[PDB]
Symmetry: C2
Subunit: 205 residues, 2 copies
């Protein structure tokens, strides 16, 4: 029954576990995890317990064990195929992103603008969206959607028909996709607006 | 009282919708029309608007223009915010070229620690060294789009805080440490990527 927020905190806990490891720390605790993640110790334990990670009495959690557990729950211990649709300014930027990690592998780059289709990129070349159906099935599970707002939906349509499994949407719009498809939004205009609201209303936050 | 964080997000959606209705010429909308377009009950819509005071009782339908104005004022979109980007890497450079910031968000600075980047002209400006935040932020830059590698994020955020920034739209995969008088919003695309991973492996859950 896990709430959507918990999953986002796990992600944060895991990032924290990676930093602890790099520092050579073997054991951590809910108190420490909470301090570094800005949430109550109780919350940390509540989140972890959802999935069965409890740790050891008066000792806490073993860093590498919890890390293995979280990376498994979050599916980060798999290799996911990725693609970018919309090789504009942001798309080209994400193509050169050096922090995808070992968990996410760019296996395609697509666009409809002929000026872009054919252009060489790190990891390959830009292909026309028309080729999505002979590139996605069994090769690309996630697609980063980076096209203008007025084109996102239609692009998502191609993606879905092509057999995509998940879409990370950067367009400021709500995509209509079948329920077998996962969608997650990265809308920074909304983020900017929430910041504006928060600046004017300090007691709120 | 005090709006739920979830409502603020919906108001943003409602506004984007009204904007689109104004463009279509539609003059009168309603809680049921707004709800369907935003995919929520009309009750939710009335409830979100409830957190805000009105002259008599709210609710026949809404006049697009009037509702639009109201929501913009609530969200602070009727003000002109000064923005800047810190970390002119591939992502920061893309954000700098973004043409859809609107009339509400105005870029007034671009900063990086790499001396090999200072001097570079960019849409509407030039890259300056971070050492200049204290001279360029006061009085004209309230929001900072932070786009530096994960390991320099907290450091850069400290300079920004010391420079007098009022808000940080953080793109780095970390939880920033900042005084409570400084607002922070995270745009974590890697976390979204991980959220997708989880969602694809657990369909019934969603
Ligand atoms: Ca203007």
């Amino acid at each position: 029954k896990v709430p959507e927020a918990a999953i986002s905190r796990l992600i944060t806990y895991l990032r924290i576990l990676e930093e602890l490891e790099a520092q050579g720390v073997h054991r951590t605790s809910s108190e420490q995890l909470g301090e570094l993640a800005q949430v109550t110790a109780f919350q940390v334990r509540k989140d972890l317990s959802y999935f069965g990670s409890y740790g050891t009495r008066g000792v806490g959690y073993t860093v590498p064990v919890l890390k293995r557990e979280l990376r498994h729950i979050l599916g980060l211990n798999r290799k996911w195929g990725l693609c970018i649709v919309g090789m504009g300014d942001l798309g080209s930027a994400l193509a050169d992103y050096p922090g995808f990690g070992e968990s996410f592998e760019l296996r395609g780059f697509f666009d409809v603008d002929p000026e872009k289709v054919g252009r060489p990129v790190r990891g390959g070349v830009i292909e026309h969206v028309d080729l999505l159906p002979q590139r996605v099935p069994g090769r690309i599970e996630i697609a980063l959607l980076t096209v203008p707002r007025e084109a996102a939906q239609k692009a998502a349509d191609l993606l879905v028909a092509a057999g995509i499994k998940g879409i990370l949407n950067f367009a400021p719009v709500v995509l209509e996709v079948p329920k077998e498809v996962a969608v997650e939004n990265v809308d920074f205009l909304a983020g900017l607006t929430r910041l504006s609201f928060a600046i004017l209303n300090p007691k709120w936050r």
